[PDB]
Amino acid sequence: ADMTLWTEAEFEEKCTYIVNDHPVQAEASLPRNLLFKYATSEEVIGVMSKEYIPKGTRFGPLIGEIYTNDTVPNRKYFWRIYSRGELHHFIDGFNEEKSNWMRYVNPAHSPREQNLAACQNGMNIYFYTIKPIPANQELLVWYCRDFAERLHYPYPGELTMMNLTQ
Amino acid sequence: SSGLVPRGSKADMTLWTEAEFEEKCTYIVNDHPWDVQAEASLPRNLLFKYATNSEEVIGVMSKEYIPKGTRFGPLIGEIYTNDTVPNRKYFWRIYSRGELHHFIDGFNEEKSNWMRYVNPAHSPREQNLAACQNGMNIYFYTIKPIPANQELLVWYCRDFAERLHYPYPGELTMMNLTQ
Numbered sequence: 001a002d003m004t005l006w007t008e009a010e011f012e013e014k015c016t017y018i019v020n021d022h023p024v025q026a027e028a029s030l031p032r033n034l035l036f037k038y039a040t041s042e043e044v045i046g047v048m049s050k051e052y053i054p055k056g057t058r059f060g061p062l063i064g065e066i067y068t069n070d071t072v073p074n075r076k077y078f079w080r081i082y083s084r085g086e087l088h089h090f091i092d093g094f095n096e097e098k099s100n101w102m103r104y105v106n107p108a109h110s111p112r113e114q115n116l117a118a119c120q121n122g123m124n125i126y127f128y129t130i131k132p133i134p135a136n137q138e139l140l141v142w143y144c145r146d147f148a149e150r151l152h153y154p155y156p157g158e159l160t161m162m163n164l165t166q
Numbered sequence: 167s168s169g170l171v172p173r174g175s176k177a178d179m180t181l182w183t184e185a186e187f188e189e190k191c192t193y194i195v196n197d198h199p200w201d202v203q204a205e206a207s208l209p210r211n212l213l214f215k216y217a218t219n220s221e222e223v224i225g226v227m228s229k230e231y232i233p234k235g236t237r238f239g240p241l242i243g244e245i246y247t248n249d250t251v252p253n254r255k256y257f258w259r260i261y262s263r264g265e266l267h268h269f270i271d272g273f274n275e276e277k278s279n280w281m282r283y284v285n286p287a288h289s290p291r292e293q294n295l296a297a298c299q300n301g302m303n304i305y306f307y308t309i310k311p312i313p314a315n316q317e318l319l320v321w322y323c324r325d326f327a328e329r330l331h332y333p334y335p336g337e338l339t340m341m342n343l344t345q
Contacts, residue, residue: 109344142340152328154339161321161333165288 003056003130004111004157008119008146011128016056021063026096026103031059036104037138046106046138053133059116061124063100064093077103079118079125082150091125102127108140111156116141179235179309180290180336184298184325187307192235197242197279204275204282209238214283215317225285225317232312238295240303242279243272256282258297258304261329270304281306287319290335295320 003011021029027044030036033053037046062079067090077093093103105127108114116127118141127141142148148155179187197207205223208214211232215225241258246269256272272282284306287293295306297320306320321327327334 107344108340110341149331154337154343158333161290162288164332165286
């Protein structure tokens with residue numbers, strides 16, 4: 001039940017609820033269980049729950065412009081996609097007319113804050129809730145273990161030197 | 167004296183690259199010439215730590231003050247590829263062009279040098295050697311002085327740890343990366 005160390009395959013296989021986007025694209029696509037957080041203007045500064053979001057809910061896939069190295073023209077909204085253990089392409093969520101609402105979700109600062117894991121399944125990126133999100137709480141994402149490892153990034157539950165030499 | 171002159175324009179080895187270790191190390195220590203090989207090869211500035219009442223080696227200690235920036239090695243052991251590998255406790259990986267190339271295996275004491283006896287550090291605070299691949303070899307570099315009669319304790323340098331998807335001293339947390 002602790003999803004911290006699940007593999008991308010385990011997220012896909014053991015997901016309970018699937019939430020599709022709502023039928024500018026980045027704003028219009030926001031599912032009906034979410035709301036935007038706004039600046040004190042109409043600038044969107046994050047995504048919040050409108051209602052209780054269960055653990056084990058999948059959002060996505062991420063929509064954005066796709067670039068390879070040979071085709072790439074701002075990298076803050078980039079997500080990397082891998083094939084057979086090599087970087088294959090980027091999905092770029094920067095352009096709000098060609099990207100969905102996932103571009104607005106802020107990153108978690110700590111394991112405690114994280115309530116979404118980002119995973120690559122197939123050729124897509126999804127965000128899975130790893131804990132319940134009560135109403136009117138911010139969605140805060142970080143890479144799942146396998147994705148973090150592909151990036152050489154830290155992640156919740158990462159083993160320490162102390163762990164590896166115990 | 168004071169100020170801009172002595173300051174000039176802008177020593178911690180924690181985040182050095184493998185190239186930096188090779189370029190900037192100060193002292194080189196070669197193995198003892200030469201011979202069992204794993205014991206006979208131990209450099210004259212080191213001693214073994216033994217199990218109590220036993221001749222069993224359980225670690226490596228300094229015999230004398232070992233300066234920061236001292237290189238030991240290269241590692242010697244049997245070399246296996248995936249296509250030739252026959253207990254991985256004493257295995258070290260060698261990479262070529264970002265891909266695993268072969269393993270150096272220190273298990274057999276007749277075919278390996280003293281570096282097989284060096285134990286891993288349990289924490290950043292305990293580490294006094296960084297292991298690096300330079301060229302086709304692995305060397306250990308002291309990252310802090312080792313006073314006389316203190317154990318040598320190794321961990322991978324940052325780039326080697328990252329090839330292994332291992333943690334390392336100085337690794338940034340999510341907290342550091344996000345603010």
